[PDB]
Amino acid sequence: GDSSLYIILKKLLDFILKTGGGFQRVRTHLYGSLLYYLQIAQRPDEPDTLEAAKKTMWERLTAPEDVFSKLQRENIAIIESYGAALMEVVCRDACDGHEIGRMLALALLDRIVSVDKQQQWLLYLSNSGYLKVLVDSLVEDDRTLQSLLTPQPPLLKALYTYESKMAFLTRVAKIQQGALELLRSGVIVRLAQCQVYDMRPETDMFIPTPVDRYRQILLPALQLCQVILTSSMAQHLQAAGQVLQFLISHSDTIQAILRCQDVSAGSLQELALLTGIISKAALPGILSEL
Amino acid sequence: PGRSSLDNIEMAYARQIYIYNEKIVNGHLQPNLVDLCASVAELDDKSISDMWTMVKQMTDVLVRMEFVRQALAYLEQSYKNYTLVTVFGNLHQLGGVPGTYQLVRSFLNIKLPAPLPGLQDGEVEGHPVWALIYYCMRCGDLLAASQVVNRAQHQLGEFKTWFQEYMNSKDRRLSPATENKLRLHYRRALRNNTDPYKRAVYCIIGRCDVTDNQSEVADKTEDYLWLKLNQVCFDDDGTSSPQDRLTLSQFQKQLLEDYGESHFTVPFLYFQVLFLTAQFEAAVAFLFRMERLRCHAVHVALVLFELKLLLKCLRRLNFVRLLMLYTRKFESTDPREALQYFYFLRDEKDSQGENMFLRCVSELVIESREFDMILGKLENDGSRKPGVIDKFTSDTKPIINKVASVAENKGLFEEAAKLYDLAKNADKVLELMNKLLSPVVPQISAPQSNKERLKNMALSIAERYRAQGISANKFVDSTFYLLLDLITFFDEYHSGHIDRAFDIIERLKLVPLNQESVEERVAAFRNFSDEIRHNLSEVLLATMNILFTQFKRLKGIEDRDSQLRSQARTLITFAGMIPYRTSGDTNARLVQME
């Protein structure tokens, strides 16, 4: 049992909240340990495992096992307290310093993220901070993909972080309350500002690599939009209208995406699916275009 | 929206590759390009379409395969076709015979050289001779052009000589002699003056002035290309040390500079210029742009590919990867189609590509996890029913082991069992199988519909393998049957049939029905295989249940209550002896009493 590990997890949270450590270097270490701990606790299991455990509890027909759920609950309580405090510290920190330590802190934020999805965090986190900052950072994401060539190097830093940021955004969108916060932050606006979509990637390093990269950005952002759309009530709701505007305004890209090949094709294929999901999920983009 | 438009298109294209794969397999003579040309006719494709015709002319247009020669031929034939069509439609019907010369006279006379005739040509007997020679040349009818000059009535006659030998040879008229002399005359006399067509003929035939362009009579973009193609001199260019050499490479670069897609306007036409110019890579990349229709670029590449080009994904040209990336879009949804596309990779025959193909397929199987579709399915003896890949064939066993082991990591049991069946590791299958059925047996009750799952799976394999030349270990099979027997006991346990359950449980020969032989049941307990050792808990308590319910004290003659009573007793002694080696529910006691 990684019970012994639990104590270290507590110490880590303590130090972070305290934000002692002149070195972000120190905090990077704390973030790394926390990340492993969160990951370790839930060995890759998916909703099926949870459903099986619930049934067994079903009810305690005899002696049940509910060990992993119990462990997750304890982790989440500890984390909550310490949490509000530490969320503040973790996000601010974020930005700066450490573009480095960043790779570590964004990964920590994402793991944490699943668990403690649901709950808790959405409220806290919401507010603050994050949203505002993260949406603005979408705009700047577009700019950051170009700056991407330069910095291929400084890339190492940022791939660990930028990808982590997209993931964090996608995860928030997966749930109702999270999607609401992102959308409130003016997601569509930042995306319009990034101008990632309102262009043609082909227009324009070995060229297939750049296409893979650009399309890659498009697939994640597109997933974030689709997730935000569906995650609310995609119908009469306001969300449906916003997504439709997204499609029409960035039409012809959707159409253009539909045919061709490579790993680039693979990325293209995923992008195509993502648009399709956006289409049906909304009022059928086609349906709207009666 | 929904865009059934593309999906329909996707399917149409997929259909065509599919037929192409059938032909390759069946040694057929199905043309890819004619097939696109047929579909492409409809619209916007009127560009893409012309592109396809260009490729098709190339069909077996090797015929050797000279870059500029073929490009020239395409342009020349196109012009000829254009000429024939104009003639083929009213008039006179032209007065004379249909000879090629006359057709061109018609083009020159009827077509737009005259609104109502006139200006700056040299004309004899109503005919611009130089224009004629130029157009005949344009058509590719060099011989006729030469003849016209012969008959000409002209006085630059030295040129006449230089035309004939240009014609005689490979058309790279290279006399170690005069060419130099012709050039001087051009510069002095011809260059600063004359009738546009005359200049064209001199310049083009001579390769007189490498700074390039013909003033008055370049009327079309293709005219523009054709002229340039005529000018380049590939063979023995390196030999001879003047710098009046113009190469395909040089031509290609000019097309790039700025001339740009915009410059080649009809952007529509730019595509064609790229193919003609030999910029295949650029051509795919360019097709790669509008909506490039990743789909279109992919297929065109496929077509160049059939042609045996590609001689060394927005910007990623390699054929394997171009195909692979294309697959990414549809692979999850349409794994079959993905296979069809990956298969094309072999079209480039050679190792490397072959492995790339294999790796791609391997990669497809893994993570798509569409095992049945991709790998195969159910024996009913009769080996595998082939998966799509198997139809293509070969390395399939090694992929299976790889996938199966991976399944083991993930713990995706069922997939593993499925994979091992294909692997034909019969013993392995049953063993994994015994494990699956074994747990799920121990647990708590209320399950087991009579139609589908691990139990059902159990039934499938036993019926299936055991009769037929069974390769499995006897031990392995034995536990298998026991698990099945226990399961049938379950079916009948509840759903009534109390009496039947005892009979079957006793048959198991696991639990002491007889005397105090309960202890022998101890001795034989530790020996028990791990799978059964686990199951016993329910065997007991099932017994004390039926035993209880059946032996409900009856109302108001032979009633031997004593048995079905002794059975409980022996069972309890049994349970009493192994409670520690059991989960910890001697709540047999609750059922035991009342």
From Swiss-Prot, chain A:
It is linked to Nephrotic syndrome 13: A form of nephrotic syndrome, a renal disease clinically characterized by severe proteinuria, resulting in complications such as hypoalbuminemia, hyperlipidemia and edema. Kidney biopsies show non-specific histologic changes such as focal segmental glomerulosclerosis and diffuse mesangial proliferation. Some affected individuals have an inherited steroid-resistant form and progress to end-stage renal failure. Belongs to the NUP186/NUP192/NUP205 family. The lineage of its organism: Eukaryota, Metazoa, Chordata, Craniata, Vertebrata. It is found in: Nucleus membrane; Nucleus, Nuclear pore complex. Expressed in the testis. This is Nuclear pore complex protein Nup205. The chain holds residues 1392 to 1692 of 2012 of the full protein. Plays a role in the nuclear pore complex (NPC) assembly and/or maintenance. May anchor NUP62 and other nucleoporins, but not NUP153 and TPR, to the NPC. In association with TMEM209, may be involved in nuclear transport of various nuclear proteins in addition to MYC. Part of the nuclear pore complex (NPC). Forms a complex with NUP35, NUP93, NUP155 and lamin B. Does not interact with TPR. Interacts with TMEM209 and MYC. It comes from Homo sapiens (Human). The gene is NUP205.
From Swiss-Prot, chain B:
It is found in: Nucleus membrane; Nucleus, Nuclear pore complex; Nucleus envelope. One of its GO terms (molecular function) is structural constituent of nuclear pore. Its main location: nucleus. It is a peripheral membrane protein. It comes from the Eukaryota. Keywords: Disease variant, Membrane, mRNA transport, Nuclear pore complex, Nucleus, Phosphoprotein, Protein transport, Translocation, Transport. Changing residue 420 to C: In NPHS12; doesnt affect nuclear envelope localization; doesn't affect nuclear pore complex assembly; doesn't abrogate interaction with NUP205; abrogates SMAD4 interaction; abrogates IPO7 interaction; impairs SMAD4 protein import; impairs SMAD4 protein signal transduction into nucleus;. One of its GO terms (biological process) is positive regulation of SMAD protein signal transduction. The modification Phosphoserine is found at residue 241. The keyword Membrane applies. Belongs to the nucleoporin interacting component (NIC) family. It is linked to Nephrotic syndrome 12: A form of nephrotic syndrome, a renal disease clinically characterized by severe proteinuria, resulting in complications such as hypoalbuminemia, hyperlipidemia and edema. Kidney biopsies show non-specific histologic changes such as focal segmental glomerulosclerosis and diffuse mesangial proliferation. Some affected individuals have an inherited steroid-resistant form and progress to end-stage renal failure. NPHS12 inheritance is autosomal recessive. Part of the nuclear pore complex (NPC). Component of the p62 complex, a complex composed of NUP62 and NUP54. Forms a complex with NUP35, NUP155, NUP205 and lamin B; the interaction with NUP35 is direct. Does not interact with TPR. Interacts with SMAD4 and IPO7; translocates SMAD4 to the nucleus through the NPC upon BMP7 stimulation resulting in activation of SMAD4 signaling. (Microbial infection) Interacts with SARS-CoV translation inhibitor nsp1; this interaction may disrupt nuclear pore function. This is Nuclear pore complex protein Nup93. The gene is NUP93. The chain holds residues 173 to 815 of 819 of the full protein.
